[PDB]
From Swiss-Prot:
Organism: Emericella nidulans (strain FGSC A4 / ATCC 38163 / CBS 112.46 / NRRL 194 / M139)
Source superkingdom: Eukaryota
Pathway(s): Antibiotic biosynthesis; penicillin G biosynthesis; penicillin G from L-alpha-aminoadipate and L-cysteine and L-valine: step 2/3
Record gene name: ipnA
PROSITE patterns documented for this protein: FE2OG_OXY, IPNS_1, IPNS_2
Details of cofactor binding: Binds 1 Fe(2+) ion per subunit.
Record field: catalytic activity: N-[(5S)-5-amino-5-carboxypentanoyl]-L-cysteinyl-D-valine + O2 = isopenicillin N + 2 H2O
Binding site for N-[(5S)-5-amino-5-carboxypentanoyl]-L-cysteinyl-D-valine: R85, Y89, S181, Y187, H212, D214, S279
EC number per UniProt: 1.21.3.1
Effect caused by changing P281L: Abolishes the catalytic activity
UniProt name for this protein: Isopenicillin N synthase
Length: 329
């Protein structure tokens, strides 16, 4: 028997406005959700998620093996030593079902001083041929900024929820240096589905991806309408209901650190489902040198002894660890 997680739907539209009290009522809901299962669905968010899913689908179903190699990250193509994060993540028929395409801040160009300095976790995006994928780069870049704008508003809600001024997080979330990423993930329908691509949890559940905590400040996730996600609670894993009009939001482990675990990063996993579906996370990362001073909302004086963590160092450590624990995606 598996229970269902309480994932409230929160109308986030006041966070784009100037009704301060209405923004506090949103913040209260974010607070409650963050202290309960850790998840909520952001609704009335203003993003055209039908176009997002449509363009994503066109890309996944039309890219060829030749293009995948040409775009592949270093884990699949030794020629691409600079592509640790951005690029195509190939499936392995018979062994690995999932495939995906990751891109970063469009402002990371050869002109960018972080690229000039070769700072870790910064890369220039790679893209397919425009004539073979008309409109795809423009769509993807536009979506990055559309979801950046939503995430900025959500971060105002999280700041208010923790008793802070509304820019406490968002001031560090900037288009010129954000390390945030979009991943366009395809989960395919396969018949027969390779058992090699299915993992079995301790509790016997068949999984496509084992338990993990997000490496992010927050995670802003769109998925098609196929239930798959679960969140761990003390009483076991609970199913997260699907909603292909909303964004599923949760705090990442950077948030857990800076709030002294008041807003924990939920432990989540992906059930195996033999169904064609899409999973499109936006990982809200800050700048490489962004440092948020920890605090403890449980203490009268709000004082935490936790060390201020530079975000870039945090991101580098978290992404290599996630690969080491749950395998190369
Ligand atoms: C909804 C999630 C569980 C989704 N998985 C994911 O988002 C996966 C596994 S946790 N994410 C990652 O591994 C981290 C990707 C980070 C990205 N390459 C970058 O350099 O910024 C899924 O649907 O599999
Ligand atoms: Fe996740």
């Amino acid at each position: 028997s598996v229970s269902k997680a309480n994932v409230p739907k929160i109308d986030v539209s006041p966070l784009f406005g100037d009704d301060q009290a209405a923004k506090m009522r949103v913040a209260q809901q974010i607070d409650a959700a963050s202290r309960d299962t850790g998840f909520f669905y952001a609704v009335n968010h203003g993003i055209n998620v039908q176009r997002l899913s449509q363009k994503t689908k066109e890309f996944h179903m039309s890219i060829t093996p030749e293009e995948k190699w040409d775009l592949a990250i270093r884990a699949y193509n030794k020629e691409h030593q600079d592509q640790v994060r951005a690029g195509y993540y190939l499936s392995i028929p018979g062994k690995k079902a999932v495939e995906s395409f990751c891109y970063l801040n469009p402002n990371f160009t050869p002109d960018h001083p972080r690229i000039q300095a070769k700072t870790p976790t910064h890369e220039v995006n790679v893209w397919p041929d425009e004539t073979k994928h008309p409109g795809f780069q423009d769509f993807a870049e536009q979506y990055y900024w559309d979801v950046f704008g939503l995430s900025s508003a959500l971060l105002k809600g999280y700041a208010l929820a923790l008793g802070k001024e509304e820019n406490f997080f968002a001031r560090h979330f900037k288009p010129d240096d954000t390390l945030a990423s979009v991943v366009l993930i395809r989960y395919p329908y396969l018949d027969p589905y390779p058992e090699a691509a299915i993992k079995t949890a301790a509790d016997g559940t068949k999984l496509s991806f084992e338990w993990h905590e997000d490496v992010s400040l927050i995670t802003v996730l769109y998925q098609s309408n196929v239930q798959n996600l679960q969140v761990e609670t003390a009483a076991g894993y609970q199913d997260i209901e699907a909603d292909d009009t909303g964004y599923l939001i949760n705090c990442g482990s950077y948030m857990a650190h800076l709030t002294n675990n008041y807003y924990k990063a939920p432990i989540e996993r992906v059930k195996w489902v033999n169904a064609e579906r899409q999973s499109l996370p936006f990982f809200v990362n800050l700048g490489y040198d962004s440092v948020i001073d920890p605090f403890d909302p449980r203490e009268p004086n709000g004082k935490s002894d936790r060390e201020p963590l530079s975000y870039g160092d945090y991101l580098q450590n978290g992404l290599v660890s996630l690969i080491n624990k749950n395998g190369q995606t």
